[PDB]
Amino acid sequence: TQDTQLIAVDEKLDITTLTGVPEEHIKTRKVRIFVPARNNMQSGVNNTKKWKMEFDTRERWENPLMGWSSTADPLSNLVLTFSTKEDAVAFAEKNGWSFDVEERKVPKPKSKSYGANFSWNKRTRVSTK
Amino acid sequence: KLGLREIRIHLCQRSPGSQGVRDFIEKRYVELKKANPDLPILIRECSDVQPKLWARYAFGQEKNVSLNNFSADQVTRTLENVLSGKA
Amino acid sequence: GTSVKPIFSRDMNEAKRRVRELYRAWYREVPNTVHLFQLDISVKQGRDKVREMFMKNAHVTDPRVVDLLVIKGKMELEETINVWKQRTHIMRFFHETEAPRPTDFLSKFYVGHDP
Amino acid sequence: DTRPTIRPRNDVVHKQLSAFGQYVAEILPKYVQQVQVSCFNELEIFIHPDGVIPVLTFLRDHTNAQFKSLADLTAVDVPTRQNRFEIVYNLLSLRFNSQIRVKTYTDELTPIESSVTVYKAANWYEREIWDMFGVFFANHPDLRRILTGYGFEGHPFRKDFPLSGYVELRYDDEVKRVVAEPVELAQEFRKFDLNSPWEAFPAYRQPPE
Amino acid sequence: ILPGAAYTEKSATYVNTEGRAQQTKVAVTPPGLAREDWKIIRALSEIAGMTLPYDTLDQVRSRLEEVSPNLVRYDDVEGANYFQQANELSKLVNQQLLADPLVPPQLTIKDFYMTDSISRASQTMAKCVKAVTEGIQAVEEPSIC
Amino acid sequence: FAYDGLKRQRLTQPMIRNEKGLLTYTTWEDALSRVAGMLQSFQGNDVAAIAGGLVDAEALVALKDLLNRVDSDSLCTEEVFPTAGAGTDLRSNYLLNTTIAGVEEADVILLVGTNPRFEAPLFNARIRKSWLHNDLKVALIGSPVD
Amino acid sequence: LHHALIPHGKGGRSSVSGIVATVFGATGFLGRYVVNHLGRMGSQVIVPYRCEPYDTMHLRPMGDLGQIIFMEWNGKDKDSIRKVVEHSNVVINLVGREWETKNFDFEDVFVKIPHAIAQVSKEAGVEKLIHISHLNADIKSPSRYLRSKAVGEKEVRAAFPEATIIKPSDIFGREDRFLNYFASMRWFGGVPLISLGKETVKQPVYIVDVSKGIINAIKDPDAKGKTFAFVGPNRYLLFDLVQYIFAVAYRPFLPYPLPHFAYRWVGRLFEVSPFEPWTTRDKVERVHMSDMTLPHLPGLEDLGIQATPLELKAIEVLRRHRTYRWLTSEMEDVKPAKTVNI
Amino acid sequence: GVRTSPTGEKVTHTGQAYDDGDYRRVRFSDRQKEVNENFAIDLIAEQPVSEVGSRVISCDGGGGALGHPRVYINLDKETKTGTCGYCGLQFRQPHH
């Protein structure tokens, strides 16, 4: 499409050689690819429509001077939104992170009927509205 | 003494290769338990897992033998060989 | 698909070539910086550090990738022979102040909950 | 206008730029992939990466375009998109007091021809983009770090890069020189999940995938 | 008194009552000097002499796969079979039923909260037990929220 | 409302018995060394282990392998299941075969000698939900617990 | 262990190692590096001082906020020591000078106060007192310093039985007053060595190794009661050592013999200065004292620290003394000196 | 108010006090442990309760815009004087 000496490279993409992630943080860290759960105390579902990749939690010790939440894992507060799952995971191997994939939990379709609240025989008659 | 501390089979519920061991446990299993009540024949199963037999001998000893496409009597002999050496 | 646009190199071989004159330049470069930068390490103590990066960077196979860090190495070499870096910058390669980190599982277990 | 809060709309400019959008699209159908004008009258020229040099020369030299000022040269790293980085140019036309935006896409490995020839301003912008993101620009006069410290590894503006980074600095007396240590915050960055669980804009609702 | 982590301080695998092995991710690190649980035995085996093979979390799950192939497959009921052979295997002994009526240990809301070490330790659980034992007025937290 | 138990009485450091018989804090090495030292001595079926309630499958398999390299197949647990017959061999025995969701299409149920409300509260809710909608006929043999 | 002393975090500036050190006399050569290692891992250091706080400013930028808190203490007042070491678990003693001020005799800064820290620390509740004394410490040595250190070790050991005693040989480093001593000898004509200094064998040790030795001794649970002798890898005859120093500095070497009684007279003249003396009669004796070999004494490699030969890190001390001519000269320019080995 | 710890420290309003060992106590020596004497907990108790006669009572906190968002306290439960959740001022019905 370009006539620019298109070599047919086959080896899977690995840019971990260049991103500069230190040796500890590239192999040991395990990332999790999941759809965020709907915050149960709310009711809206806008926050559960984008795949997100986050890293495992590490030590959180209190600073001696004043009680803090000091940590020493730079990859702690780093989440990344992703449209679809295969695109999210494609980032993981490309950056060589041992990934763990969940599946998109979605509400199963329910059947609601206001007429059921007042039935003649069925034991679904609501006691008070 | 390394005699048959426990026996573990891992078969698939639906894989055609696992069909052989499924028939074996369907017929030639109750007799095995009555023969060796002490020896626990674990049948930990799963899906898409090739039929596989694990044996546990004495201190940290474990041997492996696949049961892929093994016939009914084929796996009975395989276990019979395993528990033949009750030591 | 499999067809990708290569940076400079056209397969592994000249990609393997480019890492050579980087090593050719780096090796010639070590003794004068030890003199010019007034380093504390020996001339011998610089070649290994130049060396050990190279097969530390050995699992890489993609020709495009290989050519990508040979530019980074060339740039690092570029920013070295004009004394643009300083003693601290060069010495950062020698992990000196950072105490040795354990490797065995038992020592990992003793220090803290971390893999 | 009864409405005192809503920003006024300029349909004349909207029609004017949209016609020029069809113009540039017809002249260079080889590189131009998409052309759109936003609600606030800004024209985005979606080109293919190999069109960075040809398309730019057209808007810089054609009599009817005359975009002779490189406003800026940025990239927005989108980890989602297959080719993550997206190089963005902004051009200002002195003669026709209009602004255009040519945007192209690029992954980590594929290089983009340097626009130094068509826009000599791009030269220093060229260095920054590689330094912050890692997009290597082909046939550049001198590609080098311009912002990060000497010997700094990694590309900071890349999304996967942590906010605090990996390397700290301090003075250590047994070496009598500034030394680098692994990052160790006295306070971790308190990240806030400040996203409403309710849809904000029905107009921009994504299709029900 | 080798201290271990808790169910919110590790990446363990707990299986439910229907055979659905679920993973529990780490939320807060173990307090004090306590380590993970499998990191105790593995460290203990190395010093003792009979060193265990697995050294990382992925390794132990792989071994955990070796012992049983369902406790690694996450969030999927590996529907078992073979109810019938366990039946004729069962009528062997035949035992004999006693006369004690079937009485569950939990009979009233009172005994619900005091079940496990985590529940017994907690103060809020004790307050709920107090709330249901005596009358309906001796429990309140002063708060003008 | 049980997270506060995590902040209540907790073990932080390894502790071993002193001369008099009072547990005292100590380093990890000697606590492991004392355990490892006299685990080496005794072997055979004289080394047991009783796993508790909130245990990790990783922890179970680690203890199982460690306590089988001394040849001690006495790995026990608090809950008791009849070993007569299939016992632990056949998975179909010791689990909810029908799956929790299955109770939402069952016709009749037979709760035998249990109080699911305080044993497995969520499981009781599914019975109620299916009892509410599908009109399941619950039968209980045992205590008259509500 | 106290809940505020449980080790926490990967070893770093903000890490809680769990050590509450009380390094005494840290405002000096030895004290400078020991706090640096203590500060690096992260450890509350009480660092008492007596001098002007300005001279303690360089002690500040080597630890996290609120980790190098300073306190004012006096050597002849027990109450100052008790306040400084009140809430702590490890006490490091580095007090002691090489001259004789009118307000402090040699036996004072090596017995009297070192007794005071030793006695008060036990009453307060410290568990890892580490007192430092010269390796050559002999009761009947010709020099009072070497005598005072020997009786000093005896007294602290009695008061604090489980007090690790570190016995360093001559320590070289940037501000060492050992390599600089011979380097500065060029000013006064040639380099005067008694009998050409051909009958005195010295075994110096680099400063950082002894600094890591103290840190490892604190962490090591077996340092209780033991007496370590920190010595370098090789022993060098003093004449060859001075040959090595002046070769590294590229200054001309002009040795000449000097009878012992006349050098003692020279040391007397230099003591007259009411400021920091350059050479005392005691100092002249020390240069003559060859490092006694004590193989029975547990050395340095048992701790884990590998000694660094003086040949490697010698330009650090002597690059400053070089003129502009041979300023950029490297290590390999000057050959390693001959080493009389054990 | 401000009490004294067994070590000698001053407990604050939150009740924080470094215990006996508490190596962190070294900072306060040669210094002071800053404690505010005007304890908010007991500085609001002595304020009298208003005997206003109604069923719903507003509380601006004084000064109008200078106060806190206007909340309506329900003075109906005749066991416990209603208090504004913003300032703690106790309001009560005049016992009929």
Ligand SMILES: NC(=O)C1=CN([C@@H]2O[C@H](COP(=O)(O)OP(=O)(O)OC[C@H]3O[C@@H](n4cnc5c(N)ncnc54)[C@H](OP(=O)(O)O)[C@@H]3O)[C@@H](O)[C@H]2O)C=CC1
């Ligand atoms: N090669 C060597 O130097 C060796 C030294 N040692 C011993 O190690 C110790 C430290 O050596 P080094 O660091 O080189 O010595 P320095 O003279 O460089 O530092 C001595 C330290 O002790 C303090 N100090 C000395 N005298 C008093 C006093 N009377 N009252 C209060 N504080 C005092 C000093 O405070 P200030 O600076 O304000 O006076 C300073 O903090 C000494 O006891 C020394 O004899 C042992 C073996 C080898």
Ligand SMILES: [Zn+2]
């Ligand atoms: Zn109010």
